[PDB]
Amino acid sequence: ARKLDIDCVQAITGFDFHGGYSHPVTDGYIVCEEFKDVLLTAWENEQAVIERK
Amino acid sequence: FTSDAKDKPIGCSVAISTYSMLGHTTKRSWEAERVMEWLKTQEWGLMILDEVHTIPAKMFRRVLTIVQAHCKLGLTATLVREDDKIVDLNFLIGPKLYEANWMELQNNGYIAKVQCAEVWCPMSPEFYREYVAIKTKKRILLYTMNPNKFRACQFLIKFHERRNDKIIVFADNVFALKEYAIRLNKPYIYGPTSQGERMQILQNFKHNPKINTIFISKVGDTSFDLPEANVLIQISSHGGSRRQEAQRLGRVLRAKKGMVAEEYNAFFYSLVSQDTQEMAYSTKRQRFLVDQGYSFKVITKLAGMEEEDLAFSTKEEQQQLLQKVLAATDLD
DNA sequence: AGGTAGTCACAGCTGATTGCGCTGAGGATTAGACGTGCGATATCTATGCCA
DNA sequence: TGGCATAGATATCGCACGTCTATTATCCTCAGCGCAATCAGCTGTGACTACCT
């Protein structure tokens, strides 16, 4: 998303107390649906490079 | 002002920092930006600099321009920069205020009277033939891995352990240090040296009687404090760093109670490969210490080695070590 | 024919090079409230005693 | 016979003990910046040779 300059916010879904303090629990990133399909295909292609890398 | 332990500059009457933190030309943390701004705003009546011989470097010199300070005092153990960048240092800080007489402090008992030796280990002819064969920087591994030197080191370690002394083995080469430590089954300190493991090994060395032999690479000069010892054996040289190795020697050995009356309460030995370029490096290095009145006795024959059984007793063992070293080609 | 300037073949000076080191940005990782049992604390009632 | 001191049955509230879950920070590791001794190209030096008088 940073490469594509699209808004990307981590989805905070819970909170964990591990380590003696409550810590955020994130579940992926919530991105606007309009760019979603554009964001997905690049990401896979991104992975398609990284694995080869 | 450390990258790991951070404290707010506000209310910091006295600050302790490092050259790299202030000299970090690349982008730093946003908090570091605030610290630098506070420092520039702050007027420093006094500044203290350690290991002044390091200042002549351009990045550390820029720190002086960065910091606005009235009084700047530099403290160090040596001043013989091999790059002769000390004349300009007279204007970076000022003239040398004082330098104590080392022999005088020895007589006064403030410092341990060091007993210094240069131990000549003949090169194995097969090693020596290969030593002549190589003309490049790879030649260092040839004379730094002398099997006869290894046996002499093992004998000295046994002697001092039977004498119950703290043994510090200094070896600039990482591979040589690791090989020696693994073969002798002793702790080793090298490039990364994770800080927790480093501190654990140091504290074991200080207190645990089972651990009295520590291998320390080049990091032992100034990167951390050396626990006080009595036996310092130098195997590998930087190549003539007459100031660095002398500084590390002085840092290693300190005054010890109990042996105050004796003129030799601290023991230092330099293992030098005979007929090698290591001889010239050792002579150039000990120039400063001789200028300091310290003498070095040359010893070739080590009594008691023949009676004791040591590593590489058979020829093929040394041949196997030669195989291992030659496997480490110029890339390593 | 004779002399000195233009020009090409070997030594020092010094920046590039090969060995080692700090940073900033990554993935990894138990006491107030609630429930419960015990200890110190009042209380209604049937009946015997005295005038 | 009548009113009230006193022994019996019954809980009762305050105090302490055993147990749990909270609703947003810290700790290893890598790529990118540095320091210290050789070695080659720039520069300086000596000698060969065309050109002028």
From Swiss-Prot, chain B:
Belongs to the helicase family. RAD25/XPB subfamily. Signal peptide: none annotated. ATP-dependent 3'-5' DNA helicase/translocase. Binds dsDNA rather than ssDNA, unzipping it in a translocase rather than classical helicase activity. Component of the general transcription and DNA repair factor IIH (TFIIH) core complex. When complexed to CDK-activating kinase (CAK), involved in RNA transcription by RNA polymerase II. The ATPase activity of XPB/ERCC3, but not its helicase activity, is required for DNA opening; it may wrap around the damaged DNA wedging it open, causing localized melting that allows XPD/ERCC2 helicase to anchor. The chain holds residues 392 to 723 of 782 of the full protein. The TFIIH core complex from patient XP11BE (a patient with XP/CS who has a C-terminal splice-site frameshift from residue 741 in this protein) reconstitutes in vitro transcription about 30% less well than wild-type but does not restore NER in vitro or in vivo. The XP11BE TFIIH complex has all the subunits in the same stoichiometry as wild-type. Purified mutant protein has very weak 3'-5' helicase and ATPase activities. In another paper the mutant protein has wild-type 3'-5' helicase activity. The mutation is recessive to wild-type. It comes from the Eukaryota. The lineage of its organism: Eukaryota, Metazoa, Chordata, Craniata, Vertebrata. This is General transcription and DNA repair factor IIH helicase/translocase subunit XPB. The modification Phosphoserine is found at residue 295. Dephosphorylation reactivates the 5'-excision step. Phosphorylation has no effect on transcription or the 3'-5' helicase activity.
